[PDB]
Amino acid sequence: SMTIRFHRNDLPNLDNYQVDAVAIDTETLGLNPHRDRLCVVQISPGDGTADVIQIEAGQKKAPNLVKLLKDRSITKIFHFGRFDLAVLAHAFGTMPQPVFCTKIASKLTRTYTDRHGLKEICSELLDVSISKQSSDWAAEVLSQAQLEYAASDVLYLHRLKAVLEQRLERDGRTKQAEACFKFLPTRSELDLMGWAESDIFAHS
Amino acid sequence: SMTIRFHRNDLPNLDNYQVDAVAIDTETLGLNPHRDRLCVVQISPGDGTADVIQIEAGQKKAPNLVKLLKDRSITKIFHFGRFDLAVLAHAFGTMPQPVFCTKIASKLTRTYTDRHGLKEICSELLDVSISKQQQSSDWAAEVLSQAQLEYAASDVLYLHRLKAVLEQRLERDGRTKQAEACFKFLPTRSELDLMGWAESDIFAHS
Amino acid sequence: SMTIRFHRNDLPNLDNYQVDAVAIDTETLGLNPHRDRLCVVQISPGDGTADVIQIEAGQKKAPNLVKLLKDRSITKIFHFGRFDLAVLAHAFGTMPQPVFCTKIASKLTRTYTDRHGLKEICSELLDVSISKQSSDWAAEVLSQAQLEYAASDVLYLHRLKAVLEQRLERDGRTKQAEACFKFLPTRSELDLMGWAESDIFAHS
Amino acid sequence: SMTIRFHRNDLPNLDNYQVDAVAIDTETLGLNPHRDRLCVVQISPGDGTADVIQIEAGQKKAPNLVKLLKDRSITKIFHFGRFDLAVLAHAFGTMPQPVFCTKIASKLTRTYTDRHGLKEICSELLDVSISKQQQSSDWAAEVLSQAQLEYAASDVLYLHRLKAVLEQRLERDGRTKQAEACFKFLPTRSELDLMGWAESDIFAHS
Amino acid sequence: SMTIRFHRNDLPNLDNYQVDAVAIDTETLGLNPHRDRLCVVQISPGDGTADVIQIEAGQKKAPNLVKLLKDRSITKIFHFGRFDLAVLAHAFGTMPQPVFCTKIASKLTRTYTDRHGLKEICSELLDVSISKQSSDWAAEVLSQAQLEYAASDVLYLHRLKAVLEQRLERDGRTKQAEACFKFLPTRSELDLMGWAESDIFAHS
Amino acid sequence: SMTIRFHRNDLPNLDNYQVDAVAIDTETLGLNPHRDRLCVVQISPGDGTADVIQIEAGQKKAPNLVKLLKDRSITKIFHFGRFDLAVLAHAFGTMPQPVFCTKIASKLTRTYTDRHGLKEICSELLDVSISKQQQSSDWAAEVLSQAQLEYAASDVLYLHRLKAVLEQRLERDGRTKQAEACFKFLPTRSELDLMGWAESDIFAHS
Amino acid sequence: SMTIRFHRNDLPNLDNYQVDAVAIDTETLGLNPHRDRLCVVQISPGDGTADVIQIEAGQKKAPNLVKLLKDRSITKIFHFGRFDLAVLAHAFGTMPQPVFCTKIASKLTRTYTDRHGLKEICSELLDVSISKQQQSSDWAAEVLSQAQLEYAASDVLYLHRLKAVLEQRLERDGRTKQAEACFKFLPTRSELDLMGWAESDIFAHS
Amino acid sequence: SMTIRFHRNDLPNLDNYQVDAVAIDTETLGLNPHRDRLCVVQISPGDGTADVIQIEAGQKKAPNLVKLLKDRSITKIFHFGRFDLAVLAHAFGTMPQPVFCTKIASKLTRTYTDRHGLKEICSELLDVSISKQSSDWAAEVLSQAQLEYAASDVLYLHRLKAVLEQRLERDGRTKQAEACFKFLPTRSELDLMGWAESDIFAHS
C-alpha cells in the first residue's frame, strides 16, 4: 500500500528531493517544544511516497534534512506549521523558510466551516480518506501503524496546496495569505521565545 | 510647549514633512471601521509640533496625507497601528507602509507588565503625562474643542521619542528582528480586520 | 433648588401634563419585577420639575398616571425603559406605549464609548452633573435625599431626547431607533413572560 | 417526492408564485455577510417544489426574486430569518418584509428544549428527516452537486408546514402578538447586523 | 404491561388512595413554573400502578388530588421534589406536605457517585431498568409512549424510599434527611418567590 | 459606650442572661471548623454590654455558655449563624437552637443589594459604624489585644437591634414564615457542613 | 487467570508478602476521607494474586496490613496514592511509606496526553483491559458481589507491571529524581489533605 | 537609613556571610524564567543590611553567591521561593538548597486570612511597614529607589522565619512545613522542565 522509506537520524541523500516544495510533519513527546523532544520527522517530495525519519534523544544534527529546511528555493509545506516550525528550529538550530501552511490557507478560504483539520480538508478538497490515530513516539521501535500514521500526514499536502492556492485566488486573498506565510516563521520564533500563549497583535 | 496646527480635510502641503519618519494617530466615531467614520487624522514630524486634521463625513481624498502614507522612504509610527492602518486604508484607499508600532514594541520589551497603553508608556519611558479624558468624545463634532485638539495632538507628539527608547530596548533584549517582522505583517493584519477577521487570530490553532 | 411635587398613590390631576411627551423612572425593592414591588413613580412633563409618587404595597390603581401610560399620543421617555416598562405593566395592568429610550438611543449614536449610563450622558450631552446614590424604597417615609435622587432621574430626559434625536439623524439611524422603540414594549412583555435572561433574536 | 428547479441568477418569472407566502433560505461562503458572498437563493411556493438559484460572484440584481421580497402582500418565511434577511438585503438592496421566522416561533413555543434548529423541528413537528452534511460545503462551486441542490431545496420545502404548526402553537400558548412584534422588528435586527451591531444585543443593559 | 389509569383534570375519587404515602411526578411545558404550565400529574399509591392525569390550560381546580396534597398524614414522595412542589403549588394554590425526596436521600447516602438521576438509582438500588425519553406535554392527545414515560416516573418511588431510609439509618443521617424534607416545601416557595437561582444559605 | 467583660473559658454565671434572646459570634483560626480551632466566643444580652470569652486550645467544656445554647426558651441571634453553629457544636457538643440569623433575614428583605455583611447592615439599618481591621488577626494569641476585644464585642453588640429591624421588614414584605423555616433548618445546614457537605448545596439539582 | 483471596478485617498473616514492594488500593463510601469510611483494602504481592479485605464500620486496627504499611523496606505502590494514603492513615493511624505512584509517574512521562487514569494506562502500557462499572457501587454492602471483588482485585493486580514500565520511562526521559522527590512528598500531601488543605495547592502563589 | 552594599556580578567575598541562613530575593525582566533574565540578586545575612547585586545579560557565573546557594549547611530563606529558585537555577546552573519559604509557612499558619504577601506578613508579624513599588530591572543604572525596594525584600525574612517557626510549632505543622521545604526545589525544577502551570499532585 503506502510507499514509506524508514530512516534513522536523517535522509541518506537528497536524490528524491530535486524539488521546489516538500511536505513536512513531525511527531514529538507532546505539545511543549522545550519539554517534549522531537521524535519523528516525516517528509514527502510530493510523489505519493514518504520518508519517515526516527530522531534520537539528544540528536541535534540531521545534515540532509537541514539542507532542505535552509534551502530558500524550497517551500516547506505544513498543515499548521506554527507548531512544527518551532519544533524543528528548536531541534536543529535553524528556522525553516519559506513555508506554506494549509491550515492558514484553509482558514482564509473555507469560511463556511469551523473545521480546518487535516482529515476534514483531505476529505472535502481531495476526496481522500485518512485515519486519525495519542502514543509514545519516543519508543525504540515504531510500529508499522505508527509509520503509516506519520506518513499519511505528508502524502497529500502538495495536492492540498494546489487546491488552496486556486481557492485563495478565486476569493481574492492570495496576497494576505502570502504575508501570513512570510510571518509564520517569526510567529514560531515568538512561541519559542516565550509568547506561545499570546497573540502579539491583540490590543490587550 | 506643544504647537498645534489645525486643518480641514488635508495638510496644505508637505513643507513640514521633509523627514524620515512621521507619527500618526486617528480619531473616529468608534472601534468598528466599517461603521465608525474617520473624524480626525493627527500627524507629527517629530519636532514637537502636531497637525490635527478634521475629516469630513464622506470625505474620500486627502492627497498630501496620502503621499506620506504611500512614501516607502518614510516610516509611519503608530501606537497600536493595527487600528489606524485599517481606518486610514478604509478612508482613503492606501495601506500605509512601512510602519513602526510602539504597542507591539512595548509588548516585546516591557515583559514585566501587562500595561502597554500609550498613557502608560509615555509616563514610564518619558515621564510624560497625558490625559485620556477626551478619548471617548464626539469626534464628529462640527467644531472640535480645544481639549479635543490637545488630546489628539498629544497622541502623536511623543511617538518619535517612544520609538527611539523602544528601538534601543529591542536591541538590548535581542528582539529587533522579530519586531521588524511584526511591523512588516501589521498592514496585512489590518487588511484582514477590514476583510472580516477582526475577531480572529489567524495564527491560532482553533 | 429642585421643584419636586410629592404625591401618594397617583397624580392628583393632569393639569401639568397637557404635553406630548413625559419623562418617567421608577424605584422598586429590587431588580426582579415579580418579587420586588413598585415603590415610587417619578415623572416630569419636561418643565424642569418632577412629580414623585409613592406607591403602596398592594396598590394596583393609579388612574391619572395610567391615563398617561395608555395615551398613544404621549411618548413615554425612559433611560433604559426595558426595566421600567416591565415594572409599570406588572403594577398597573397595561404596557405603556409609545416610548423613547435614551439608553438605546445612546447605544446607536455614542459608538465611541461603552458608558451609556444616565450620569455619563447627562454630563457629555448636556453639561449637567447629577449625583448617583442602594436603599429601601419601600420605607414608610422617603427622605428628602431620596426624593431628590428620584426626581433627578426624570428632570433631563426631554433634553437628552432632543440631542439624541439629532445625533440619530446625523449618523443615519433614525429609522432603526424608531423600530427599536416600537419593539421595546414587547421586549419588556417577554421579560415578564419568562425570557428576561434570553436574547430572543440570538441564534442560540 | 421533491421537485427541484435549478436556475442561474434569478427566477425566470413568477408563474409558480401566485401565493400568499413563500419559503426562502440562502447559502453563502460563511456567516459574515460583508465577507462571505451570497451563493444560492432557494425558494418554495409551499407546494412541495423548490427553486434553487445559483448567484454569481458580483451579481447585483435578481429582479423577479426581488419582486417577491418587496411584495408586502406575500409573507416571506425563513428559519432564522435574521441571517437570510441581512444576506438578501446586502446582495440586492431590498430588505424583505413582511416575514415569519420559524426559529423565533420555535423559541416562543418549544419552551421545553434548547434545540431549535431546522433539522430538529422538522423531525419533532413533522416527522421529516433532513441531513446537514452539505451545510458546510463550497457553495461557490462552479457547478453545484446534486447533494448540494437537495440540501438547499430541503431547507425550504417544509417551512410552510412548520409555520402552520408553529402558528397554532403560538395561539395555543398565548404568544401570537409577541411573535408578530418580533417578526416586525426582525428586518431592523438584520439591518443593525449589517450596520455594525451583529455581536450586540441592542436591548441589553450593558 | 404497565397498569395505567388515564384521567382528565383530577382523580375520580380516592378509592385507590387509602394510603399513608403517594408517589408523584409532573410534566410541564418547561422548567420555568411561572411561564410553563402544568400539563400532567402522575401519581401512584405504591401498588405498581399509576394514575396519569391530563391538566388543562387555565385549570386551577383538582379537588381529589388536592386533598392528597393537603393531607398531612400522607407523605408525598418525589424524585427531586423541589421542582414538582413549586409547579403543584403554583397550579393549585397549596404547597404539598409532608414530603420525601429520593434525590436528596440519594445525595445523603450514595456518596460514592455523582449520578443521582432516577434511572441510575432505580438500576442500582432496585435492579429496575427504566427508559429515559423532550416533547410537547401540552398536546391535546398524549401518546401511549408519553403515558408510559410519565407512569414510569412514579412506579418505583415507594420502593426507592424503603431502600434509601435503610441506607440513611446505616450511614447515620436520618435526622438530617428529615430536616431537609421539612425544609423542602419552603425551598420551593422561595423558588416561586424569586430566589430560584440563589442558595439562601450561602455566605455570598 | 460599650461595656466589655473579658473572661477565660466560660461565663462565670448567667446573672446577666435572664433574657429571651442572646447575641453570639465566634472567632477562630480560620474558616475550616475541623482544622481551625475556636478561639473566642462573644455574647451579648442585648443591653449594650458584651462578654468576650477566650477559649483555650483543646478546651472541651464551657458549661454556662452551653446552658444558654441548649435553652430552647432563649433565641440565639447570629450574623451568618451557619458558621458559628458549626464551630460551637464542634467545640462543645451542643447544636444551639432556636436561632435567628441576620444575614439570612437580610437576604430575604434587602432585595435591592448583594451586600449583606454585618458591617454593611449595621451602617444601613442602624447608622452604626464597625471596623473589620481585626477580622483576620491571630485569634489564638496568648493575650488578646484591646482592638481584638473591641472587634469581637462589636460583632454582638448590635444583633438584637438588627433583629428587631429585620423582623419588621420580614413582616412588612411578607416573608416571616419562610425566614422562620430557614432558621429551623439552619442547625441542620451547619451539621451537614461538619459532616462533609460544606461545599454543596444539598437542595441543588446537581 | 487472577486469583482472589477474600478476607474480613485483615490479612491472616504475611506469608504471601515476603516481597520488596506491594500494590495497594482502597474502596470507600466516597471521596471525602473524614465522611466516607474505608470499606475495602486490596493488596497484591505482584505475583498475579490479590487479597481483598472487607473493612468493618468502626474498625480501628488491621495489624498485619499495618506491618506492611510501616515496613520501610517495602515500597507501597498505588495509582493516585494521594487518596489511598490519606484513607489508610485515617483508618489505622499509620502513614504508609515509602511509596510509588503510577499516576504521578504517568504525568511525568506520558506528556502527550491528559488521560492518566488506571484503566487508560493499563490499556496503553500493558494492553490490559479493566472495567470501571463497579467503581461507584455500595462498597459498604454487607456482602461484596463477585463483580465488586473482581473490580477491587483488578485495581492492584497490574501496579507492579505498570511501575516497571513507568520506571523505565522515567529513566529514559530523564525525570527519575524529580519523580522520587514527588513520591517522598506524597505522604505529606495526603497529611495536608486530612488536615484541611484538600482543596488547596500548597505550592501555588495564590 | 537602609544599609545597602551595591555590587556588580557577585559578592566580593563571604566575610559578611559566616552564617547558617541567608535571605534572598531576585529581580527579573518578568515572570517567565526562560524568557526574562535575572537582573538583580538581593541577599542579607540577617543583620539588617542587604547586598544588592546587579546581574549582567549573558552572565552565568557568580562564584561567591553560588557557594552560598550550594552550601547545604546554609538555609536559603525566601518569600515565595518557588519563583526565585527557578530563576537562580536557570541563571547559575545549580538548584539552591536547603530552603525555607515564608509564604508556604504563612499559608500553613495564618489560616485566618487569604493575604500572604510580604507586606502583609511584615505588618502583622513584625509591625514593620514596607512600601510596595513594575519597572525595567535590566536598566544600566539602577535608581536609589530601586536599590531600596530590592533591599527591603530581604531585610526581614530572618525575623519572619523566627515568628513563623514558632507559629508552626504552636499549631502543630512543623513536620509538614519541613517536607514542603524539602520538596520546593523539585517544584521549581518541574516549573523549569515544563510543568509551571500544573499541580503535579492533582487528580486531573
For residue F182, give the chain E residue with the closest CA: E183
Residues H46, H100 contacting (CB under 8 angstroms): no
HSE toward the beta carbon, residue D31, CA cutoff 13 A: 9
Residues D55, D144 contacting (CB under 8 angstroms): no
Residue with cell 505588618: H123
Give how far Cα G13 sits from Cα of G5, G17, G62, G72, G74, Å.
Answer: 13, 9, 11, 18, 16
φ/ψ (deg, to 5) at C41: -115, 125
For residue D139, give the chain A residue with the closest CA: A112
Give the method used.
X-ray
Residues A78, A85 contacting (CB under 8 angstroms): yes
Q: Which residues contact E9 (CB under 8 A, 6 or more apart)?
A: E53, E54, E55, E56, E59, E61, E62
Beta bridge partners of A27: A40
Q: How is residue B26 annotated by DSSP?
A: E
Q: What angle do CA G189, G195, G200 make, to 5 degrees?
A: 55
Strands B75-78 and B99-101: parallel
Residues D206, C116 contacting (CB under 8 angstroms): yes
D111: closest CA of chain E, how far (Å)? 5
Residue whose C-alpha is closest to residue F16's, from F70, F87, F65, F73: F65
Residues of G in contact with H201 (CB under 8 A): 82, 104, 182, 185-186, 189, 201
Residues B102, B163 contacting (CB under 8 angstroms): yes
Domain with E104, as residue range(s), is 1-204
Asked if G113 and A134 come within 8 Å (Cβ–Cβ), the reply is yes
Q: Using CA atoms, how far apart are residues D65 and D43, in angstroms rounded to an integer?
A: 9
Q: Using CA atoms, how far apart are residues F40 and F140, in angstroms rounded to an integer?
A: 8
Residues of F in contact with G196 (CB under 8 A): 32, 34-36
Give how far Cα E97 sits from Cα of E18, E67, E101, Å.
Answer: 17, 11, 11
Residues G78, G99 contacting (CB under 8 angstroms): yes
Answer whether the bond into residue G187 is a cis peptide, omega within 30°: no
Q: Using CA atoms, how far apart are residues G54 and G44, in angstroms rounded to an integer?
A: 15
Which of F32, F35, F196 has its CB closest to that of G32? F196
Give the CA radius of gyration of chain F.
Answer: 16
φ/ψ (deg, to 5) at H148: -70, -35
Q: Count CB neighbours of A34 within 10 A.
A: 15
Q: Using CA atoms, how far apart are residues D41 and D26, in angstroms rounded to an integer?
A: 5
HSE toward the beta carbon, residue H204, CA cutoff 13 A: 6
Chains touching A by CB (3 or more pairs below 8 Å): B, D, G, H
Please classify residue E89 by burial: count the beta carbons closer than 10 Å to its beta carbon, then call 0-12 exposed, 13-18 middle and 19+ buried.
buried
Instruction: Report the amino acid identity of residue H133.
Output: Q
Residue with cell 429642585: C2
For residue E194, give the chain C residue with the closest CA: C35
Instruction: Report the amino acid identity of residue F22.
Output: V
Answer whether the bond into residue C63 is a cis peptide, omega within 30°: no
Residue whose C-alpha is closest to residue E180's, from E121, E65, E118, E102: E102
Q: Using CA atoms, how far apart are residues E29 and D172, in angstroms rounded to an integer?
A: 12
Q: How is residue H166 annotated by DSSP?
A: H
HSE toward the beta carbon, residue E56, CA cutoff 13 A: 9
F34: closest CA of chain H, how far (Å)? 12
Q: Using CA atoms, how far apart are residues F80 and D166, in angstroms rounded to an integer?
A: 50
Residue with cell 386533598: E67
Please, do chains E and F touch (3+ CB pairs < 8 Å)?
yes
Answer left, alpha or beta for residue B48, where phi above 0 means left and psi between -120 and 50 means alpha: left
Q: Which segments of chain C does DSSP mark as H helices, in order?
A: 63-70, 81-92, 102-109, 118-126, 144-152, 157-170, 174-190
Q: Count CB neighbours of B155 within 10 A.
A: 28
Residue whose C-alpha is closest to residue H34's, from A199, A194, A196: A194
* For helices A174-190 and A81-92, angle between their N-to-C axes, nearest 10 degrees: 40
Asked if E32 and D111 come within 8 Å (Cβ–Cβ), the reply is yes
Instruction: Report the amino acid identity of residue D46.
Output: G
Which of H107, H111, H200 has its CB closest to that of G202? H107
Asked if G34 and F34 come within 8 Å (Cβ–Cβ), the reply is yes
Please classify residue A109 by burial: count the beta carbons closer than 10 Å to its beta carbon, then call 0-12 exposed, 13-18 middle and 19+ buried.
buried
Cell of D38: 451570497
Residue with cell 498629544: B154
**Can you tell me whether residue H95 is helix, strand or coil?**
coil
Q: Which residues contact H107 (CB under 8 A, 6 or more apart)?
A: G200, G202, H116
Asked if F32 and H111 come within 8 Å (Cβ–Cβ), the reply is yes
- Give DSSP secondary structure letters for G63-86: HHHHHHHH-TTSEEEESSHHHHHH
Residue with cell 505508527: A146
**Can you tell me whether residue D105 is helix, strand or coil?**
helix
**Can you tell me whether residue D31 is helix, strand or coil?**
coil
B48: closest CA of chain A, how far (Å)? 27
Residue with cell 476521607: G33
First to last CA, chain C: 51
Q: Using CA atoms, how far apart are residues F176 and F109, in angstroms rounded to an integer?
A: 10
- C-alpha of A76 from chain center: 7
H4: closest CA of chain A, how far (Å)? 34
Chains touching E by CB (3 or more pairs below 8 Å): C, D, F, G
Cell of A40: 519523528
Chains touching G by CB (3 or more pairs below 8 Å): A, E, F, H
φ/ψ (deg, to 5) at G202: -65, -20
Which of A32, A35, A193 has its CB closest to that of H35? A193
Strands H49-54 and D38-44: unpaired
- Give DSSP secondary structure letters for C40-74: EEEEE-SSSEEEEEEPPTT----HHHHHHHH-TTS
In chain D, which ranges are E strands?
A: 3-8, 21-28, 38-44, 49-54, 75-78, 99-101
Cell of F123: 451602617
Q: Using CA atoms, how far apart are residues F26 and B195, in angstroms rounded to an integer?
A: 63
Residue whose C-alpha is closest to residue B66's, from B101, B100, B17, B106: B17
- The arrangement of strands across the sheet holding A21-28 comes to A3-8, A49-54, A38-44, A21-28, A75-78, A99-101
Beta bridge partners of E4: E50
Cell of B114: 501587562
Give how far Cα B71 sits from Cα of B67, B76, B96, Å.
Answer: 6, 9, 8
With the C-alpha atoms ordered D106, D108, D112, D116, is the resulting torsion angle positive or negative?
A: positive
Instruction: Report the amino acid identity of residue F128.
Output: V
Q: Using CA atoms, how far apart are residues H152 and H4, in angstroms rounded to an integer?
A: 10
Asked if C173 and D188 come within 8 Å (Cβ–Cβ), the reply is no
* For helices E174-190 and F176-192, angle between their N-to-C axes, nearest 10 degrees: 140
Beta bridge partners of D3: D49
Residues of G in contact with E124 (CB under 8 A): 137-138
Residue in C28, C29, C34 to test binding to E, most E beta-carbons within 10 Å: C34
In A3-149, which ranges are E strands?
A: 3-8, 21-28, 38-44, 49-54, 75-78, 99-101
Number of H helices, E strands in chain F: 7, 6
Residue whose C-alpha is closest to residue G186's, from G118, G125, G66, G103: G103
E18: closest CA of chain D, how far (Å)? 35
Residue with cell 528531493: A17
Cell of D162: 412548520
Q: What angle do CA F181, F186, F188 make, to 5 degrees?
A: 110
Asked if E184 and F203 come within 8 Å (Cβ–Cβ), the reply is yes
Residues of H in contact with A195 (CB under 8 A): 35
Q: Using CA atoms, how far apart are residues C29 and B61, in angstroms rounded to an integer?
A: 56
- C-alpha of H49 from chain center: 15
CA dihedral C25→C31→C35→C39, nearest 10 degrees, is: -30
Q: Using CA atoms, how far apart are residues F155 and F84, in angstroms rounded to an integer?
A: 12
Which of A34, A193, A194 has its CB closest to that of H194? A34
Residue whose C-alpha is closest to residue G62's, from G30, G34, G26: G26
Answer left, alpha or beta for residue A96, where phi above 0 means left and psi between -120 and 50 means alpha: beta
Split into its structural domains, chain D has a count of: 1
Cell of H183: 520538596
Q: Using CA atoms, how far apart are residues E172 and E55, in angstroms rounded to an integer?
A: 41
Residue with cell 429585620: F166
First to last CA, chain H: 51
Residues in chain E: 204
Asked if B185 and A183 come within 8 Å (Cβ–Cβ), the reply is yes
Residue whose C-alpha is closest to residue G104's, from G130, G90, G126, G83: G83
Q: Using CA atoms, how far apart are residues D21 and H183, in angstroms rounded to an integer?
A: 75
Q: Using CA atoms, how far apart are residues D178 and C186, in angstroms rounded to an integer?
A: 6
In chain E, which ranges are E strands?
A: 3-8, 21-28, 38-44, 49-54, 75-78, 99-101
- C-alpha of H144 from chain center: 21
Please, do chains B and G touch (3+ CB pairs < 8 Å)?
no
Q: Which segments of chain H does DSSP mark as H helices, in order?
A: 63-70, 81-92, 102-109, 118-126, 144-152, 157-170, 174-190
HSE toward the beta carbon, residue F67, CA cutoff 13 A: 11
Strands F75-78 and F21-28: parallel
Q: Which residues contact D157 (CB under 8 A, 6 or more apart)?
A: D2, D23, D44, D48, D50
**Can you tell me whether residue B57 is helix, strand or coil?**
coil
G157: closest CA of chain F, how far (Å)? 32
HSE toward the beta carbon, residue F94, CA cutoff 13 A: 18
Q: How is residue E59 annotated by DSSP?
A: -
Residue whose C-alpha is closest to residue C42's, from C70, C72, C2: C2
**Which residue pairs, CB below 8 angstroms and at least 24 apart, start in C136-145?**
C136/C29, C136/F110, C136/F112, C136/F169, C137/C27, C137/C28, C137/C29, C137/C39, C137/C40, C137/F112, C138/C29, C138/C37, C138/C39, C138/C57, C138/F172, C138/F173, C142/C40, C142/C52, C142/C54
**Can you tell me whether residue A7 is helix, strand or coil?**
strand
For residue A113, give the chain D residue with the closest CA: D136
Cell of A132: 486519525
Cell of B84: 489606524
Instruction: Report the amino acid identity of residue H159.
Output: R
Interface size C-F, in CB pairs within 8 Å, comes to 24
First to last CA, chain G: 50
Cell of G26: 482502597
Residue whose C-alpha is closest to residue A177's, from A123, A110, A93: A110
CA dihedral E109→E112→E114→E116, nearest 10 degrees, is: -40
Q: Using CA atoms, how far apart are residues B178 and B24, in angstroms rounded to an integer?
A: 23
Residues A177, B159 contacting (CB under 8 angstroms): no
Answer left, alpha or beta for residue A5, where phi above 0 means left and psi between -120 and 50 means alpha: beta
Q: Using CA atoms, how far apart are residues G104 and G115, in angstroms rounded to an integer?
A: 12
